[PDB]
Design a protein around this ligand. Structure first.
Ligand SMILES: Nc1ncnc2c1ncn2[C@@H]1O[C@H](C[C@@H](N)CC[C@H](N)C(=O)O)[C@@H](O)[C@H]1O
Ligand SMILES: [Zn+2]
Ligand SMILES: [Zn+2]
Ligand SMILES: [Zn+2]
Ligand SMILES: [Zn+2]
Length: 965
């Protein structure tokens, strides 16, 4: 801010461990400021013009006075005063990712060296064809045995020096004195970049045979495994095996996946007792990958005239058998039912511009084309046959595996169309005698589809019981467009039980009201015994939902200092968590202060160096939990030239943790809301690093750009579902179609649902509450003028302020709303059809200034919008209504009609979305308790992580727990 222009503006060292501190101390040397609440210049108060008749305005320069009391006009006490939360992915700085996959680094020509003396030492130890392997070799003085590391020189100088481990030494009668090189990857070639230790290397699946003449020199490389007491080493002082070793010698401790930015513990792959002298883990693994991805049929069950049928086939590590469920692209096949195509349009008639003067501002959006709609979910079908053609001789072709399936219908696939999806379970299907033939290769995955009546338990238990589960009760006949019982051939007929490991004691920092913990708990992997939330209202709410937890309502920095000093309890008399108590650490630290993309500064970094991110990493380091989870706004991966992301990974790698990062879209996991979150996963040395959750629901493509660029390298997660998904997208209708109509200003904290749930989504969220009570279906009370605006926004899909009628209106308070007057000729936007001007200030002129007297007040159409319209894409979305078929925007923390981030009017009712509706958009069970005043509740809901999203992530961690032997 320039000064205090009507502004009502409202130790410092973070608690760190010596390891974390030293990692961050290295950067942005200083040798060659508390948060201030701003006001949202949008509410009907900030809009208010300085009256100039009170101690405030009368104490300013404008109204005769001294600029002493910077206090703003009294008629401008912003009720929505707020801190600028970095939770602002409002930058879309990746809407056009134009890049490939990280080309296997070492791909390139190397320089042959002129070592003048290379002679085998000892006698051969094998003779596989033209290859006679040796145990040792001697080059110009130097000596090499397998297991030793060498260095090769790239031909291109734009490439670094290569380091490799010699896994074999042999001599080929056709190539000479060879060796196998298993390449290492230097830290600066990983996402860490220049933030890594200059001596640290990482293992990668890159190797190649090569002539010993390419060897440049011998190099020492030591392995740095986790100590016996790794989990207790948190907080200790930086040790050392030896100085010449970890201090001055190349070392490594982890494996690295360049495509996924995954740092993992070294593979354990074993060597058959046929290659203990020529084993290469890389080849071993690469061999697994090539074989794990060759669609191949197995046992056969019949040999016919033109093709042979098999009982099962395997593709991508998954075994497919006849009768199984399979996922197919929407292109795989069509349904007999003709996808109806609409015709005609409105009976030709333009809009009345005298009445709707700001409607022309909608043409730019229109012509600019509309953004793509969510893809169709997967086609689903039962495997009837698995067959291979027949070679031009008589033998089955395996390079071509085909599958004949039964087409399953989704309710929306029948003649009933989309409306059929409204009340149907998301996993409800219909059997069909329609068949299709596709290439096994087209299969996207395996799924379970069972006849509901023969299930050993109810539909709900079966659905909440496992991934990719579908069911059917009736069959569908497209020809007669009728519903009949399923045939008998449509029924059934190493499966054990459902092992349930104990929950991990979880410490959730910056817990907010609990979204993240709720989802984790729902995944059945955790029990948040300890939470930290400095903001009281949200801390109270966490208490309400987790009676068995210990909630600390204080700066996360004070508690950690206590435990580090040896304290076991705190001033309030609460028991502090100690090493061994925390098995999992999760949280979302605020990034306020360094939310910009611009590079770090010497000053701007000294503050980040003491930010909550460093404090959170300190917690991770000290407690050394089994699994670490850091969630944040998508842009966490970009802030400050990605240094925030690189230093966070760098710090985890230094701790010896396995770690990765990724970006997820919440809408892909069950909510009718767009919200991308950055996710950093870390896992203990003896754990299995989790994978990111594969999308469950199809969602708008433009909202699903998940890739990330760091220092010109593109990273993606393990996610393979990029076009379709198992379930249809969840809409606003799915979210709140069942809610009782309330009015602007609703305050009844407890009302009746007055009806039954309608959508599958609603069924899940209202739960199995004995005496169901609809809570918090309350919404902000808008001024008589704002309310008037809302009731005048059409219900037609995509209506907003640009649809308001320029008419005089009496208000609920009694005053009259005047018409907006077009006073200046805007040469850019022209005139209306009748000849009316379109400008509302002098600025629409040639550079001209803003005649302060040109401002208008209390006009249905807000003067400010056409005023600055041309420079904000016509403020599309303001006073806009949510669409029943659409989704919420990143759930607002304080719904405002003219708020940038705000497209918040209810689909049909003339009000802004209620607290409960917002909680629905986040996936919170209707029984989830919130605490505080209405604005406090909105904040709670909005800052939280959507449970469905955290649940998905939680299930990935669960898989790792079950896999640990
Ligand atoms: N120094 C601090 N110590 C503890 N909590 C803080 C601190 N600074 C901010 N917070 C709280 O951190 C939270 C950040 C939230 N956006 C996180 C929400 C959370 N992941 C959820 O699912 O509900 C807010 O509730 C803040 O009030
Ligand atoms: Zn305001
Ligand atoms: Zn005043
Ligand atoms: Zn190899
Ligand atoms: Zn102006």
């Amino acid at each position: 801010r320039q000064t205090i222009r009507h502004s009502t503006r409202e130790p410092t060292k973070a608690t760190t461990t010596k390891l974390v501190y030293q990692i961050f101390d290295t950067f942005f040397a200083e040798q060659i400021n508390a948060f201030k609440r701003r006001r949202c210049g949008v509410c009907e108060v900030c809009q208010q013009p300085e009256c100039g008749k009170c101690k405030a305005c009368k104490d300013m320069v404008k109204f005769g006075g001294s600029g002493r009391s910077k206090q703003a006009c009294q008629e401008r006490r912003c009720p929505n005063m707020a801190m600028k939360e970095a939770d602002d992915d409002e930058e879309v700085d990746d809407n056009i990712p134009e890049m490939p996959s990280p080309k296997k680094m070492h791909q390139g020509k190397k320089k042959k060296q002129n070592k003048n003396r290379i002679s085998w030492v000892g006698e051969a130890v094998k003779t596989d064809g033209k290859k006679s392997y040796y145990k040792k070799v001697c080059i110009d003085a130097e000596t090499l045995e397998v297991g030793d590391c060498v260095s090769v020189i790239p031909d291109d100088s734009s490439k670094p020096l290569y380091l490799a481990r010699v896994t074999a030494l042999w001599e080929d009668s056709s190539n000479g004195q060879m060796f196998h090189a298993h390449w290492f990857c230097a830290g600066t070639d990983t996402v860490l970049g220049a933030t890594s230790d200059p001596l640290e290397l990482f293992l990668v699946d890159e190797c190649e045979d090569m002539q010993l003449s390419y060897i440049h020199s011998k190099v020492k490389v030591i392995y740095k495994a986790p100590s016996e007491n790794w989990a207790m080493e948190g907080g200790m002082d930086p040790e050392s095996l030896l100085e010449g070793d970890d201090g001055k010698t190349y070392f490594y401790q982890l494996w690295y996946d360049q495509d996924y930015a995954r740092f993992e513990s070294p593979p354990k792959t074993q060597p058959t007792e046929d290659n203990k002298f020529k084993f290469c883990v890389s080849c071993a693994r690469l061999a697994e990958m090539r074989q794990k991805e060759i669609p191949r049929v197995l046992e056969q069950l019949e040999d016919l005239d033109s093709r042979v049928l098999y009982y099962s086939a395997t593709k991508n590590g998954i075994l497919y058998r006849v009768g199984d469920g399979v996922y197919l692209p929407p292109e795989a096949f069509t349904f007999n039912i003709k996808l109806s195509s609409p015709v005609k349009r409105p009976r030709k008639e333009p809009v009345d511009e005298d009445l709707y003067p700001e409607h022309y501002r909608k043409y730019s959006d229109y012509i600019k084309g509309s953004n793509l709609d969510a893809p169709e979910p997967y086609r689903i079908g039962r495997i009837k046959e698995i067959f291979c053609p027949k070679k031009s001789n008589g033998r089955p072709n395996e390079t071509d595996i085909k599958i004949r399936v039964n087409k399953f219908y989704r309710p929306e696939n029948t003649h009933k169309s989309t409306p059929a999806s409204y009340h149907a379970d998301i996993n409800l299907l219909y059997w069909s005698d329609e068949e299709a033939v596709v290439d096994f290769k087209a299969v996207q995955g395996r799924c379970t589809v069972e006849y509901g009546e023969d299930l050993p338990e109810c539909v709900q238990v079966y659905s909440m019981g496992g991934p990719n589960r579908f069911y059917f009760l009736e069959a569908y006949n497209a020809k007669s467009k009728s519903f009949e019982d399923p045939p008998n051939h449509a029924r059934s007929p190493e499966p054990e039980i459902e092992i349930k490991l104990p929950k991990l004691r979880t410490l959730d920092v910056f817990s907010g009201c609990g979204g993240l913990s709720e989802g984790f708990h729902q995944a059945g992997i955790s029990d948040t015994l300890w939470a930290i939330e400095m903001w009281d209202p949200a801390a109270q709410a966490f208490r309400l939902n987790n009676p068995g937890s210990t909630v600390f309502t204080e700066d996360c920095n004070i508690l950690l200092k206590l435990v580090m000093a040896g304290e076991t309890t705190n001033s309030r008399g609460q028991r502090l968590p100690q090493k061994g108590d925390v098995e999992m650490l999760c949280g979302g630290p605020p990034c306020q202060g360094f939310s910009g993309m611009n590079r770090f500064n010497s000053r701007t970094y000294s503050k980040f160096k003491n930010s909550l991110v460093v404090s959170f990493l300190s917690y991770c380091d000290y407690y050394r939990p089994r699994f670490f989870l850091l969630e944040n706004v998508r842009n966490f991966v970009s802030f400050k030239r990605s240094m925030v992301l690189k230093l966070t990974l760098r710090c985890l790698v230094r701790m010896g943790y396995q770690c990765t990062f990724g970006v997820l879209q919440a809408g892909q996991y069950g909510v009718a809301q767009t919200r991308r979150r950055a996710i950093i996963l870390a896992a203990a040395p003896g754990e299995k690093l989790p994978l990111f959750p594969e999308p469950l629901h199809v969602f708008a493509p433009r909202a699903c750009q998940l890739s990330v660029v760091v220092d010109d390298k593109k990273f993606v997660s393990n996610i393979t579902r990029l076009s379709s998904g198992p379930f249809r997208t969840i809409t606003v209708r799915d979210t709140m179609s069942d809610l009782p109509e309330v009015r602007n200003g609703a305050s009844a904290l407890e009302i009746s649902y007055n009806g039954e749930p309608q959508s599958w989504f609603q069924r899940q969220l209202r739960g199995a509450q004995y005496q169901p009570i609809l809570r918090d279906h309350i919404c902000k009370d808008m001024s008589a003028l704002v309310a008037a605006r809302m009731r005048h926004i059409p219900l037609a899909p995509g209506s907003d302020w640009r649809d308001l009628p320029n008419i005089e209106v009496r208000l609920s308070d009694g005053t009259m709303a005047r018409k907006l007057r077009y006073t200046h000729h805007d040469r850019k936007n022209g005139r209306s059809s009748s000849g009316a001007l379109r400008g509302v200030c002098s600025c629409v002129e040639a550079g001209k200034a803003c005649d302060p007297a040109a401002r208008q007040f209390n006009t249905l159409i807000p003067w400010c919008l056409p005023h600055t319209g041309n420079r904000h894409n016509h403020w599309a979305g303001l006073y806009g209504r949510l669409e029943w078929d659409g989704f919420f925007s990143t759930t607002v923390t304080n719904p405002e009609p003219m708020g940038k981030q705000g497209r918040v009017l209810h689909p049909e009712q003339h009000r802004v979305v209620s607290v409960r509706e917002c909680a629905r958009s986040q996936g919170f069970p209707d029984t989830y308790r919130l605490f505080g005043n209405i604005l406090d509740k909105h904040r709670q809901v909005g800052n939280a992580v959507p449970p469905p999203l955290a649940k998905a992530i939680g299930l990935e961690i669960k898989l790792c727990m079950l896999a640990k032997a």
